[PDB]
C-alpha cells in the first residue's frame, strides 16, 4: 500500500518506485536503474539500458520470473501490484528504481 510514491516516467514507460527485488534469474536484494541516452555513441539500437544491481553490478542469460518484491518503507510485499504493472506494460523492467535521463 505505497501508491503515494508511484511515478510513471513515460518517456521510457517505467514505474520509478523503490522496491527491493528477490529474483530467481537465485539472488536477493535487487534493484534496477535505467538510462535515457538516445544520443549514445557505440553503446545495439536502443535508447534505454538496464544496469541491474545486487549491491553492485551482477556482471551479466536472463529470464527472471519475479519471486519476491518488498517495498522499502512499510515492507508490504507489493508482489501482485508489480504483477499488475507487468500485466499491462509490454516493456522490459516495469519497476525501475531510478532513471537517470541523460
Amino acid at each position: 500500500g505505497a501508491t503515494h510514491d508511484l511515478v510513471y516516467h513515460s518517456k521510457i514507460n517505467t514505474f520509478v518506485w523503490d522496491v527491493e527485488f528477490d529474483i530467481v534469474l537465485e539472488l536477493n536484494k535487487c534493484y534496477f536503474v535505467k538510462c535515457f541516452n538516445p544520443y549514445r555513441i557505440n553503446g545495439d539500437f536502443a535508447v534505454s539500458s538496464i544496469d541491474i544491481f545486487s549491491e553492485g553490478k551482477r556482471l551479466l542469460e536472463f529470464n527472471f520470473k519475479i519471486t519476491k518484491a518488498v517495498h522499502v518503507a512499510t515492507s508490504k510485499d507489493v508482489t501482485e501490484i508489480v504483477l499488475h504493472l507487468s500485466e499491462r506494460i509490454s516493456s522490459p523492467f516495469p519497476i525501475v528504481k531510478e532513471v537517470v535521463y541523460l
Binding site: 513515460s10 518517456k11 521510457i12 514507460n13 536503474v33 535505467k34 538510462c35 541516452n37 538516445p38 544520443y39 549514445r40 555513441i41 557505440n42 553503446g43 545495439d44 539500437f45 536502443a46 535508447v47 534505454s48 539500458s49 538496464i50 544496469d51 544491481f53 553492485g56 553490478k57 556482471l59 551479466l60 542469460e61 509490454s90 516493456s91 531510478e98 537517470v100 541523460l102
Partner: protein, 628 residues
C-alpha cells in the same frame, strides 16, 4: 527622499523643496571657475565628495544624460575565487583594524570559521570607543552570522566531524540569547544618525522588495526594466562582497540570485521567442560566475531544458578560462594532498561541478582544456563524480570541440590507470548511470578511430589467464589495441550467446559476424517456434537495418509483432501495431523507419491519431523533427 537614485548613475528630483543642492553640486563638478570660488577646506571636502560620487557610480543629473556605460567591477578576492591570494593575505600581519576585518571575512570564506569568529571578537574588544563605529557594528553582526553558520552547520553534519565540542559549548555560552533586533537601537547618538542606512543588516529578511519587482518581469512583460533588474543584482551583490559581509553565505541571498537569474534568462528567452511576426543577453564573465556559484547542477539542467542556451553566446572567454583553470588547479592542489576543510570542500565542490557543467558552452585553449580535463579525470575526488558522470561532464567538454590529440593522450592515461586498477578482483565500477569506461574508448573511436594504445598493447602482451576482471574490462576496451596483442586477448573466444553477444560483448562485433551465428539465430528461432507452440527486437532491427545477411527470417512471421514490423513492412497488419514501441527507438532507427514508406505513412496516421487524441509531446516531437 529628496531625490530618486536610479541604477544608471542618473539622479532625478523628488520632494526636494529646497535649494537643489545636488544640482548645484554637479554644477560645481563641470565648472572649473566655481571650484576656485570656494574655500580651501571646502575645496578638499569637494575633492573627497568627488571621489565618493565617482566611486559609487553616480555620475550626473538626468538632465544631462548621455553615454550611460554601466559596468560592475567587483574588487574582492572572495568573489573571483582567488583562494591562494586570500590565504597569503591571512598569514600576513595586519597593521590596521580594517585590514583585520577583511582578513576575518576571508577566513570566514575559506571554512576557517573558528579563527574568523575569534578575530571578529578581537576587533570588538579593540575598536570599541570611536573608530567610526562601522568596524564595531558590522563585525558584531558578522560574528553573529558566522555563529549562525557554525550552529546551523553542525546541525546536519552530525545528523563528518567539523568542530570540537568545547568550541560549541563556548559559543553557546557566549551567543546564548543574542537579539540582533536592538543592536542598532542601542548604538549611540552619533551612530544612529550618521548610519541610519546600516540597520537592515541587523534584520533577518531584507532582500524582498527586488523579489516583488521580479514579478513585474514575470507578469505582463526599446528599453525595459530587465537591464534595471540586472543592474540591481549587480548592486546588491557588489554591496555584500565588497564591504565583506558574511550574509552572502545564507539561503536568502542564494534564493535571491537563483530566482533573479532564472527569470532574466527565461525573460530574455521570452523576448527572443517573440517571433510570431517579425523574422541579446550577452552573458559576460560575471554571469558565468553567478550561474556557477549560486545555482546547483540541477538548476542549470533546468535552464537547459525549458529555456534554450543555443542562442545564448559567451564573451570575455579568456577570464572564463582563468576561472575554470583556477577551479582545476584548486581541486588539484586540494586533492593532490590530504587537505580537507570539510565545510570548504562542500561549498567548493558545488561551485566546481556547476562550473564545469556550465563550461560545456564556452570555448577554451588546448592547454586549458588539458588542465581542466586532467583535473576532471585524475585529481577530482570520488563520491561526487562517478565514472559515467565524468563521461557526462567530459562528453560536454568534448562535444562542441575538436579534440586536439593531447586530450586523447590524457584519456589514454586514464584508461591505463583503469586497466592497472582492475587488477584486483573486487572492483565495483560505480557509475550507477549505466555509462562505463568502454564509452571513453568509444569517444576516442568517435574522434580518432585510427588510435593505437601503447601501454594497453603491452598489458595485453601480459595477460595469460590469471586476472579475470582485467581481461573482461580490457575486452570492453577492445578496438584501441594492436593486432597481435588483439589476437592475444582473442585467445578467449565468444560463446553461443545471442544478445549476450551484445550484452557480454559490448564492443559492436557485428563487423565480425560469423556465418554460424546466422545458423545460431536459426537454431534459436526454431527452438522458440517448437516452444512457441507449447532481446528479440535487437536482431529484428538488425535484419531491418540490413547489417546481417540472411533470408531465413521470412518463415518466422508471428513470434513477435515488432519482428513482424521489421521483417515484412508491406504485409504487416498496421491495425495491430502497438504504439509504445516508438519511444524506445533512437534517431538512426527513427530516421530510417521514415525511409521505409509502407511503415512511414501508416505510422504517420497512428501518430496523428495519438497526438490529436491524447496530449503527448514525445510523439509530437517525433512527428516534427524526424518523420515529416
Amino acid at each position: 527622499y529628496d531625490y530618486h537614485f536610479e541604477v544608471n548613475g542618473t539622479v532625478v528630483r523628488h520632494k526636494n523643496k529646497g535649494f537643489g543642492y545636488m544640482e548645484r553640486f554637479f554644477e560645481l563638478k563641470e565648472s572649473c571657475d566655481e571650484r576656485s570660488k570656494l574655500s580651501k577646506k571646502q575645496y578638499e571636502r569637494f575633492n573627497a565628495l568627488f571621489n565618493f560620487f565617482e566611486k559609487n557610480g553616480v555620475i550626473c543629473m538626468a538632465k544631462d544624460a548621455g553615454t550611460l556605460n554601466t559596468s560592475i567591477e567587483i574588487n574582492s578576492l572572495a568573489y573571483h575565487g582567488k583562494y591562494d591570494v586570500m590565504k597569503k593575505f591571512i598569514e600576513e600581519q595586519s597593521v590596521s583594524i580594517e585590514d583585520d576585518y577583511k582578513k576575518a571575512f576571508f577566513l570566514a570564506c575559506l571554512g576557517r570559521w573558528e579563527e574568523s569568529y575569534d578575530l571578529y571578537s578581537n576587533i570588538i574588544l579593540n575598536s570599541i570607543d570611536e573608530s567610526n563605529g562601522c568596524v564595531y557594528y558590522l563585525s558584531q553582526i558578522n560574528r553573529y552570522r558566522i555563529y549562525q553558520s557554525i550552529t546551523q552547520a553542525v546541525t546536519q553534519f552530525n545528523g563528518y566531524k567539523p568542530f570540537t565540542d568545547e568550541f560549541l559549548a563556548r559559543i553557546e555560552r557566549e551567543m546564548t540569547n543574542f537579539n540582533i533586533d536592538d543592536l542598532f537601537n542601542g548604538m549611540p547618538f552619533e551612530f544612529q544618525k550618521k548610519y541610519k542606512i546600516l540597520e537592515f543588516l541587523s534584520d533577518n529578511q531584507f532582500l524582498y522588495d527586488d523579489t516583488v519587482k521580479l514579478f513585474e518581469l514575470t507578469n505582463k512583460v526599446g528599453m525595459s526594466s530587465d537591464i534595471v533588474v540586472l543592474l540591481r543584482l549587480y548592486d546588491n551583490l557588489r554591496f555584500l562582497y565588497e564591504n565583506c559581509l558574511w550574509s552572502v553565505s545564507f539561503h536568502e541571498f542564494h534564493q535571491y540570485i537563483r530566482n533573479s537569474m532564472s527569470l532574466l534568462i527565461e525573460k530574455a528567452e521570452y523576448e527572443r521567442t517573440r517571433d510570431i511576426d517579425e523574422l541579446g543577453f550577452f552573458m559576460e564573465y560575471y554571469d558565468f560566475v553567478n550561474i556557477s556559484r549560486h545555482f546547483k547542477i540541477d538548476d542549470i539542467k533546468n535552464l537547459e531544458r525549458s529555456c534554450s542556451i543555443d542562442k545564448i553566446r559567451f564573451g570575455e572567454q579568456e577570464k572564463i578560462e582563468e576561472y575554470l583553470v583556477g577551479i582545476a588547479e584548486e581541486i588539484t592542489k586540494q586533492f593532490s594532498a590530504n587537505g580537507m576543510n570539510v565545510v570548504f570542500y562542500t561549498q567548493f565542490i558545488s561551485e566546481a561541478k556547476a562550473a564545469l557543467y556550465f563550461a560545456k558552452y564556452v570555448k577554451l585553449s588546448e592547454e586549458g582544456l588539458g588542465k581542466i580535463v586532467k583535473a576532471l579525470l585524475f585529481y577530482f575526488p570520488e563520491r561526487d563524480l562517478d565514472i559515467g558522470k565524468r563521461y557526462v561532464w567530459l562528453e560536454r567538454l568534448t562535444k562542441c570541440n575538436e579534440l586536439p590529440k593531447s586530450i586523447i593522450s590524457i584519456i589514454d592515461d586514464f584508461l591505463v590507470l583503469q586497466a592497472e586498477k582492475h587488477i584486483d578482483q573486487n572492483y565495483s565500477e560505480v557509475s550507477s548511470n549505466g555509462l562505463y569506461s568502454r564509452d571513453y574508448g568509444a569517444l576516442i573511436k568517435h574522434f580518432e578511430k585510427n588510435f593505437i594504445s601503447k601501454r594497453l598493447s603491452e598489458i595485453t602482451l601480459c595477460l595469460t589467464q590469471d586476472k579475470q576482471k582485467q581481461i573482461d574490462f580490457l575486452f570492453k576496451l577492445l578496438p584501441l589495441l594492436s593486432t597481435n596483442a588483439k589476437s592475444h586477448l582473442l585467445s578467449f573466444k565468444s560463446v553461443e550467446n545471442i544478445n549476450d553477444l551484445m550484452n557480454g560483448i559490448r564492443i559492436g562485433l557485428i563487423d565480425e559476424f560469423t556465418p554460424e551465428h546466422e545458423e545460431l539465430i536459426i537454431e534459436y528461432l526454431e527452438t522458440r517456434k517448437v516452444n512457441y507452440i507449447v532481446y528479440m527486437s535487437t536482431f529484428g532491427i538488425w535484419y531491418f537495418l540490413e547489417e546481417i545477411n540472411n533470408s531465413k527470417m521470412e518463415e518466422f512471421i508471428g513470434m513477435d509483432d515488432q519482428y513482424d514490423f521489421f521483417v515484412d513492412p508491406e504485409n504487416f497488419d498496421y491495425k495491430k501495431f502497438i504504439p509504445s514501441w516508438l519511444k524506445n527507438y533512437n534517431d538512426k532507427l527513427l530516421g530510417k523507419i521514415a525511409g521505409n514508406k509502407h511503415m512511414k505513412h501508416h505510422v504517420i496516421e497512428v501518430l496523428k491519431e495519438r497526438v490529436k487524441n491524447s496530449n503527448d509531446k514525445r510523439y509530437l516531437e517525433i512527428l516534427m523533427n524526424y518523420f515529416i
